[PDB]
């Protein structure tokens, strides 16, 4: 480390948003499944 300790000030917000969206989508799907499970 030392002078080139640039990583100590970086965060991968991109990957975080990608995962959070994948999860949100999955939860939404599951919800729909449960809602329509019975009318078919």
């Amino acid at each position: 480390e030392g002078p080139d300790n640039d990583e100590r000030f970086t965060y991968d917000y991109y990957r975080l948003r990608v995962v959070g969206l994948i999860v949100a989508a999955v939860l939404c799907v599951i919800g729909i499944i449960i809602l329509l499970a019975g009318k078919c």
């Binding site: 917000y13 975080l16 939860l27 919800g31 449960i34 809602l35």
Partner: protein
């Protein structure tokens, strides 16, 4: 429109003569009026047509939905928001637009709610308009000595009008000459049987005399003449309709509950505002700022989504009713049924079927019962004896009625039959259990028939015998049991014949009194085989001299008949009585029939007795017995006319099974008012016009759809398109279910209040950075929260709802202090603490420890301080610290959702446990899933920190509200436990909503 002169009982000039009548109105008894005079009167007073109802433009019922009690509160909230924005604009530079957004949002919410409610009431109005079928009608008037058929709108007072069996009485006539003319006074007077109209006068009451024809009545059989006495709106039913239209509407119960709810919400809102106003003035702030603080706290204490949630909730309960054929015109009339505690019903057309049907039959010294139910769902009467066959032949032959052409599609009971009611019932019974009567009649040709005389009181006829081995002649007569009994000497027992000894004569007398006491009309059928040796096949029996033996006939059996009740009438009455609903019969029919129908449907439980019954069982006068020992009472209309208010109050206060007979429509209204005077909700169920003044003044009116009148249908609040009475039970059940659900949903939308306000209060008192932004409060109150609150309506019952007593209106409210103590006091507090926890965590991880946050708002807000030292010594620019504050708003909103999970689960049930009821509500599960997906979407979607100002969260923050949620679940679980084990304890009178 004098209402008192319309509230009085109808008067008339019936007690007069034909000369006095012609001398008062002016009219020739044999020539009628002249065309010139007829037109002079037509233009002098107006056409014989009822006035149309008061129309209503569509923009009026839209402005109505935009107002009320809840929408008005949201309106004042929007007004306050714009006022605070104006003050901030004229007092400070760079005014934030938060208030303008909140105000336009509130206005949009009110507009959308109004559009939805209006669309629903319009849907109901369209399906209601598709029922008014008005075909023009023309009457037969005699002018200048000639008969002419002119439109009903051209009939005037004084001309001569002739009627014929099958036509409708145009105006109010005064019969001058009739020929066996019967009339159907069921709609106006409620008389189930056809009363004969005679030119002579008989009773002091105009509704009882036979010399007066009434508007909208139809002549069943016969022809008659008459002078038009009353025309146009001045007719009887005209004054009744005008009175119905000239009545107020009232104010249902759900509205009163919403009003008291708003009263509490505003009490606590203005209290917190005036208090933090004096407090802010005590801490140094200026007036200009304190005013904005007052308006902000008042607005913050207003539920924007409770309006849409309540409206959609009620609409959801309305669609089920529409699925079972129960249509409501308004939207709040769906709950009134559940709160009802006294149902006033009608007999003719509502409790009964208004159709004569063969009830009991006598044959082989044994009483037999026949099925008298619409759908024919009952027990047969043992159609295996020869006696029944002979009876069927007598009834099917000695009968002149025949089904109306073109009825091959309708059922055997609902088809039209041209003839008397008795003959129609006999024909229907024979066609029901004996096959096609047309073939039974063509199988035996009728040779000679002697009509029904008023003196002979018997109808006889001779026909050929279809026996291929016997060419003799058959004679069949029918009539009054006494007259027929005096003309017989044999009895057809099990097929064989036997003498008429006094044993069977006494059994016949007992059978006659048995069928008579049942309120039925009994007839006697007998026949005889004429000896072909004394009357050959060629001899013609002209009806002139005694060609047939009047006596020595063979009596086969009696046949009773009466109007039966609808299929689900007894079961529905029993279900209503089980739920603690007092059933009181109110009808303008004969008391001898009203009492029988009451005992047959459950109004007068078997075993109870009236004062007359006791006096008859003891053989003592009626003035000696005490009226307190009689549970059921039959109040006659004539006696009701001379009764004070206190007497009526005592009648309803001491008698549990009351039956009002021979009561006029005005008296019906008086009864409804006497019931309301105490404090109970009233539901009136009717079908005719006589029920119009009763359906309007009652808290809720139920009109029949097929057998109901247009006036009563337009003046009622609920319509039974299928004429099923069990719908009343279904309605009283749904009215309760959606009530406990409204309570749950209200507590749900009120629990979030605290974690939405507390941040601003701590912001002003403690001077800490703003915790909950405005677009987050909006994303919570109008977003996520909507689906769960709507789902709370689909909750099933916990205990039997059709078992508990009706809710008391003066003590058990919809929103009491027990709810406020939970939402505002215990759950909301925990949710607010969880939000503040996530807040402090976010600020502590970035460098601002809790000790350095108290006292920073002055510099944390300042837009020109680009060097704010944190707990570690770092220098933060303005936009950098603002980004952190926004991320704290995002995490606060997510914490709110996390605690709402456990709040929706503890709100699902009010007393029972979750491991008992069960999570069978799929809508609630979908609500939780969607509630979480929306929060994740609002935070992780790109471009949100620009549009809505919500930054992404780090996976470790999302878990800061979990312990608070589980704690809320455990606390409410143990709460809903002591209530069960300890009924009536502290936890019940303190936390049981």
């Amino acid at each position: 429109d004098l209402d008192e002169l319309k509230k009085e009982v109808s008067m008339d000039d019936h007690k007069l003569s034909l000369d006095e009548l012609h001398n008062k109105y002016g009219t020739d008894l044999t020539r009628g009026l002249t065309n010139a005079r007829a037109k002079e009167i037509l233009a002098r007073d107006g056409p014989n047509s009822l006035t149309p109802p008061p129309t209503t433009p569509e923009w009026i019922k839209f402005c109505r939905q935009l107002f009320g009690g809840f929408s008005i509160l949201l309106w004042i909230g929007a007004i306050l928001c714009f006022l605070a924005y104006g003050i901030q604009a004229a007092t400070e530079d760079e005014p934030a637009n938060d208030n303008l957004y909140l105000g336009v949002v509130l206005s949009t919410v009110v507009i959308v709610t109004g559009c939805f409610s209006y669309y629903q009431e319009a849907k109901s109005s369209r399906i209601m308009d598709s029922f008014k079928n008005m075909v023009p009608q023309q009457a037969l008037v005699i002018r200048d000595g000639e008969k002419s058929t002119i439109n009903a709108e051209f009939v005037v007072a004084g001309d001569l009008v002739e009627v014929k069996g099958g036509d409708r009485i145009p105006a109010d006539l005064r019969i001058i000459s009739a020929h066996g003319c019967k009339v159907d006074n069921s709609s106006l007077t409620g008389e189930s049987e056809p009363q004969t109209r005679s030119p002579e006068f008989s009773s002091e009451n105009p509704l009882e005399t036979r010399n007066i024809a009434f508007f909208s009545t139809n002549c069943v059989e016969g022809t008659a003449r008459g002078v038009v006495v009353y025309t146009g709106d001045r007719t009887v039913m005209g004054r009744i309709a005008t009175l119905a239209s000239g009545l107020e509407v009232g104010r249902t119960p759900i509205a009163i509950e919403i009003e008291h709810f708003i009263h509490i919400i505003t009490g606590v809102a203005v209290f917190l505002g005036v208090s933090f106003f004096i407090l802010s003035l005590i801490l140094g702030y200026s007036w200009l700022e304190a005013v904005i603080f007052l308006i902000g706290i008042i607005v913050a204490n207003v539920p924007e989504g409770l309006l849409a949630t309540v409206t959609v909730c009620l609409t959801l309960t309305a669609k089920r009713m529409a699925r079972k054929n129960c249509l409501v015109k308004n939207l709040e009339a769906v709950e009134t049924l559940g709160s009802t505690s006294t149902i006033c019903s009608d007999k003719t057309g509502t409790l009964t079927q208004n159709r004569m049907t063969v009830a009991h039959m006598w044959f082989d010294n044994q009483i037999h019962e026949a099925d008298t139910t619409e759908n024919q769902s009952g027990a047969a009467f043992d159609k295996t004896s020869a006696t029944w066959s002979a009876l069927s032949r007598i009834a099917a032959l000695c009968n002149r009625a025949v089904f109306q052409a073109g009825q091959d599609n309708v059922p055997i009971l609902k088809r039209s039959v041209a003839g008397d009611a008795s003959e129609s019932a006999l024909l229907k019974c024979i066609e029901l259990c004996c096959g096609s009567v047309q073939g039974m009649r063509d199988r035996n040709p009728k040779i000679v028939e002697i009509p029904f005389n008023s003196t002979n009181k018997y109808q006889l006829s001779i026909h050929e015998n279809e026996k291929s081995s016997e060419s003799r002649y058959l004679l069949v007569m029918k009539g009054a049991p006494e007259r027929i009994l005096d003309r017989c000497s044999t009895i057809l027992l099990n097929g064989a014949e036997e003498p008429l000894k006094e044993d069977m004569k006494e059994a016949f007398q007992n059978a006659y009194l048995e069928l008579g006491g049942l309120g039925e009309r009994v007839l006697g059928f007998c026949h005889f085989a004429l000896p072909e040796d004394k009357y050959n096949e060629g001899y013609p029996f002209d009806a002139d001299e005694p060609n047939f033996p009047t006596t020595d006939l063979c009596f086969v059996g009696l046949m009773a008949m009466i109007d039966p009740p609808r299929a689900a009438v007894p079961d529905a009455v029993g279900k209503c009585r089980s739920a603690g609903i007092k059933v009181i019969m109110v009808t303008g029919d004969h008391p001898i029939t009203a009492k029988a129908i009451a005992k047959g449907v459950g109004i007068i439980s078997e075993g109870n007795e009236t004062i007359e019954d006791i006096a008859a069982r003891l053989n003592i006068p009626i003035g000696q017995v005490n009226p307190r020992d009689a549970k059921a009472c039959v109040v006659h209309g004539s006696d009701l006319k001379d009764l004070s208010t206190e007497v009526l109050d005592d009648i309803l206060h001491y008698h549990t099974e009351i039956v009002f007979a021979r009561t006029s429509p005005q008296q019906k209204l008086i009864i409804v008012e006497g019931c309301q005077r105490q404090g109970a909700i009233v539901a009136v169920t009717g079908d005719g016009v006589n029920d119009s003044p009763a359906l309007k003044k009652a808290d809720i009116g139920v009109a029949m759809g097929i057998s109901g009148s247009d006036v009563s249908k337009q003046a009622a609040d609920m319509i039974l398109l299928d004429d099923n009475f069990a719908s009343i039970v279904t309605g009283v059940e749904e009215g309760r279910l959606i009530f406990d659900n409204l309570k749950k949903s209200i507590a749900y939308t009120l629990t979030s209040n605290i974690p939405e306000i507390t941040p601003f209060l701590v912001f002003i008192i403690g001077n800490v950075p703003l915790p909950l932004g405005t677009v987050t409060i909006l994303c919570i109150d109008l977003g996520t929260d909507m689906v769960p609150a709507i789902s709370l309506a689909y909750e099933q019952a916990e205990s039997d709802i059709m078992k508990r007593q009706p809710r008391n209106p003066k003590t058990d409210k919809l929103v009491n202090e027990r709810l406020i103590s939970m939402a505002y006091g215990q759950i909301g507090m925990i949710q607010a603490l969880g939000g503040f926890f996530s807040y402090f965590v976010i600020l502590a991880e970035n460098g601002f420890l809790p000790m350095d946050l108290i006292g920073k708002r002055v510099r944390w807000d300042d837009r020109w301080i680009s060097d704010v030292e944190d707990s570690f010594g770092q220098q933060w620019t303005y936009e950098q610290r603002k980004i952190v504050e926004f991320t704290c708003h995002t995490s606060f909103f997510i914490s709110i959702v996390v605690v709402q999970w456990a709040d929706l689960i503890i709100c699902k049930t009010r007393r029972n446990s979750i491991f008992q009821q069960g999570m069978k509500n799929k809508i609630l599960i979908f609500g939780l899933f969607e509630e979480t997906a929306l929060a994740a979407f609002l935070s992780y979607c790109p471009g949100t920190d620009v549009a809505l100002r919500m930054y992404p969260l780090k996976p470790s923050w999302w878990f800061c509200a979990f312990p608070y949620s589980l704690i809320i679940f455990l606390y409410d679980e143990m709460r809903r436990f002591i209530i069960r084990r300890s009924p009536g304890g502290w936890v019940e009178q303190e936390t049981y909503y």
